[PDB]
């Protein structure tokens, strides 16, 4: 509620880079007089709940793949996946494991999660070869090609990414029967942060 609301103000998710992009006008609140955009974060929180309700609908959690190609997204995606039932792909994305049926990696999902579409674009491309819905953590200048649910966040930030995955995992856990809404959590956020 209001405590969860205060929990995300402090981190630096709200700031988004330059290159405003056209498809994120509704997701940006304005550009600061310095020249750096900022995100409403109310839409971020709401779209966060909504993406979690997307994810929870998958009966087999192992059919959700969260990918990352950034050094400080790898810890977040790995530990979010191991908290939930999803299975992650950090580091380099082999450019064939969604369309090639012979390579040993494969492991096609029913749902994909992307930390940043611009850096993980290859997986986004492969998704449109096998009908993977794709949910992406898009920021001010991230392209929206083959992106269905985009939450407006910041992808460059260490703490921004860590907190974003923290609330994602927390909210899907609430959606599950694991924990009631009113209980205050016990897993602390900085454990997601890249050292």
């Amino acid at each position: 509620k209001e405590e969860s609301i205060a929990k995300m103000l402090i981190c630096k998710v709200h700031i988004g880079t330059k290159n405003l992009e056209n498809k994120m006008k509704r997701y940006v609140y304005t550009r600061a007089k310095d020249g750096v955009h900022i995100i409403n974060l109310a839409k971020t929180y709401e779209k966060l709940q909504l993406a979690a309700r997307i994810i929870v609908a998958i009966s087999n959690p192992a059919d959700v793949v969260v990918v990352s190609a950034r050094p400080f997204g790898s810890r977040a995606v790995l530990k979010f996946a191991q908290y939930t039932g999803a299975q992650a792909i950090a580091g380099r994305w082999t450019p064939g494991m969604l369309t090639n049926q012979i390579i040993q990696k494969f492991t096609e999902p029913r749902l994909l999660i992307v930390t940043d579409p611009r850096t993980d674009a290859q997986s986004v491309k492969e998704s449109a070869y096998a009908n993977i819905p794709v949910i992406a953590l898009c920021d001010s200048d991230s392209p929206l090609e083959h992106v269905d649910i985009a939450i407006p966040c910041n992808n460059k930030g260490k703490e921004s990414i860590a907190l974003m995955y923290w609330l994602l995992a927390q909210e899907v856990l609430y959606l599950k029967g694991v924990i009631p809404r009113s209980e205050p959590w016990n897993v602390m956020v900085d454990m997601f942060l890249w050292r």
Binding site: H14, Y29, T30, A32, K33, I38, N40, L41, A42, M191
Partner: peptide
Amino acid sequence: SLKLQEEERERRLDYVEPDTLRMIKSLG
């Protein structure tokens, strides 16, 4: 992949900008 990174795993384990205030006052 052996036990030489496991213990490292647990070792690893363990006002504001003017626009944003009016922003939050607008939001609630």
